[PDB]
């Protein structure tokens, strides 16, 4: 039962050795994406009636 | 035109959608090794069995093959007309008891959030194998609290009362108990009678009479 169970540890070993980035850099990248693409979001900033395909 | 294609396809939808709405759909639930197979032999992943009896088309879905958790796919069968539950009477001593495991399975489907209004057809199986093996062993092995004569008539009526009284929704759903026979006509006829009673009572609840 140990030999089948042991294989999870090598996966956990793979997860253990990776480099992690700080939340301050990670969270900054998400807000940077949102601000840069605000103009291409028709749900965030509503579009005029004529431009809107479903209800022109 | 494109709206002509939309209207032709919509005609086939309404045509096929009423042809498949006059068919009784029956979820079949049982325990492992509980005698589900003998019922399906008489009437002819998820397995669909289609039979027609007395101008009623019955679709019976044996979903016991699924080893996945029940809570993730049991809401697909919310619209089934009735639930056929098969219990092996002979398995009251076999294996934590097998009859105690079937009673907890029954108490989950009957008191479910989706099956509040769906009637349960209860089948008790192997009444001949139950009748002979009941003298070498009492029901005190299975049900200790039993105080009755150890004969087939009293013992079967107590097991049926244990299974029935797990119905907390006594007003909206009903358990129809039939002991299965070896003759093919009798078991299918009971299924048709139980389905007929539930369909009539479903019609009565839409008037406001029931």
């Amino acid at each position: 039962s140990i030999a089948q169970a042991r294989k999870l540890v090598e996966q956990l070993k793979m997860e253990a050795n990776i480099d992690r980035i700080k939340v301050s850099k990670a969270a900054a990248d998400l807000m940077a994406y949102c601000e840069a693409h605000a103009k291409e979001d028709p749900l965030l900033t509503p579009v005029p009636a004529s431009e809107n395909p479903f209800r022109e | 035109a494109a709206a002509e294609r939309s209207k032709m396809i919509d005609k086939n939808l309404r045509e096929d959608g009423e042809k498949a709405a006059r068919e009784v759909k029956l979820l079949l639930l049982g325990a492992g090794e509980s005698g589900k197979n003998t019922i399906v032999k008489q009437m002819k992943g998820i397995v669909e069995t289609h039979f027609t009896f007395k101008d009623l088309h019955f679709k019976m879905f044996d979903v016991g093959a699924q080893r996945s958790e029940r809570k993730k796919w049991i809401h697909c069968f919310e619209g089934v007309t009735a639930i056929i539950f098969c219990v092996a009477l002979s398995a009251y001593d076999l294996v934590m008891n097998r009859m105690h495991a079937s009673m907890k399975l029954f108490d989950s489907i009957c008191n479910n959030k989706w099956f509040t209004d769906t009637s349960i057809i209860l089948f008790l199986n192997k009444k001949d194998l139950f009748e002979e093996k009941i003298t070498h062993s009492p029901l005190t092995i299975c049900f200790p609290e039993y105080t009755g004569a150890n004969k087939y008539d009293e013992a079967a009526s107590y097991i049926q009362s244990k299974f029935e009284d797990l119905n907390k929704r006594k007003d909206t759903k009903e358990i129809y108990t039939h002991f299965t026979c070896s003759t093919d006509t009798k078991n299918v006829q009971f299924v048709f009678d139980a389905v007929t009673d539930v369909i009539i009572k479903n019609n009565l609840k839409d008037c406001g009479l029931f």
Binding site: - | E18, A21, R22, D55, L56, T196, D197, I199, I200, N203, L204, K205, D206, C207, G208, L209, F210
Partner: protein
């Protein structure tokens, strides 16, 4: 204008103000939900639009006729005949529900395939066109045009007659007794009791085939339905009868008034008895 008449008005006003909100609430709950678009809810919303029309138009028209403003004759026919059309439509809608509830127990397996909601609409439209003919029959020449022009000519005037308009003055009683009551009110009442007696046998037979309480509750539901219909329409129609066959039979005035509001009262009790009993309908109102 009179003590009895004033009392009748106030009763009519509250009958209207209880008939219009309850019935529009039936129509509202039908239109907002999509689980109430089968065959039997078509008949119920047919009854609902009939009875809200009663509380909307029939009650003000009935009040105006009672007060008797002086009116030309053909103008009073177009006022008095919408009372006949709308009230009749209520009766025929009630009959249509009973045939629907009879088919649920006579042919319960093939019910959905036989009375399909398309066929529901032709029967509903059939009820309404039969409602309009019976109401417009006075305008086609079955009225007191004959009798009134003799009385008009006697005092000397000529032209078109102007009368204090009252329902007994413009609508002949041989129409009301022989055509409204004996053909279009009394056979619907007798078809209802034959349908519901037959329904009770089939329901009782199935139950016998904890059960005594449900059977008595079903009998109480059917009895209440038949009694409320027979308490509404029957007294007014009998009063018309004993005014035709016994011309000299004197009856008090407030008796005639009290009969009329009972007829209107049926349109108020309809949603309580018919739609509020269905479980699916009740829960979308509570929620």
């Amino acid at each position: 204008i009179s003590a009895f008449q004033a009392a009748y008005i106030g009763i009519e006003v509250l009958i209207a103000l209880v008939s219009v909100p309850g019935n529009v609430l039936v129509i509202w709950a039908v239109k907002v939900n999509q689980a109430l678009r089968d065959a039997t809810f078509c008949f119920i919303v047919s009854l609902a639009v009939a009875d809200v029309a009663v509380g909307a138009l029939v009650i003000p028209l009935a009040i105006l006729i009672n007060i008797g403003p002086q009116t030309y004759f053909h103008t009073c026919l177009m006022v008095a005949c919408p009372v006949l059309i709308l009230t009749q439509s209520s009766i025929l809608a009630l009959l249509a529900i009973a045939v629907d509830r009879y088919l649920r127990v006579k042919i319960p397996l093939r019910y959905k395939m036989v009375v399909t909601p398309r066929r529901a609409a032709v029967a509903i439209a059939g009820c309404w066109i039969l409602s309009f003919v019976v109401g417009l029959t006075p305008m086609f020449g079955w009225n007191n045009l004959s009798a009134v022009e003799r009385a008009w000519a006697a005092n000397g005037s000529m032209g078109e007659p102007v009368i204090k308009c009252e329902f007994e003055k413009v609508i002949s009683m041989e129409y009301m007794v022989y055509f409204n009551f004996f053909v279009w009110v009394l056979p619907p009442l007798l078809l209802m009791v034959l349908i519901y007696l037959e329904v009770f046998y089939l329901i009782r037979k199935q139950l016998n085939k904890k059960y005594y309480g449900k059977e008595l509750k079903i009998a109480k539901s059917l009895a209440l339905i038949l009694f409320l219909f027979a308490l509404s329409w029957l007294p007014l129609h009998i009063l018309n009868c004993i005014t035709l066959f016994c011309p000299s039979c004197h009856k008090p005035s407030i008796l005639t008034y009290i009969a009329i509001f009972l007829t209107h009262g049926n349109s108020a009790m309809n949603p309580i008895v018919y739609a509020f009993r269905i479980q699916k309908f009740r829960v979308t109102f509570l929620k």
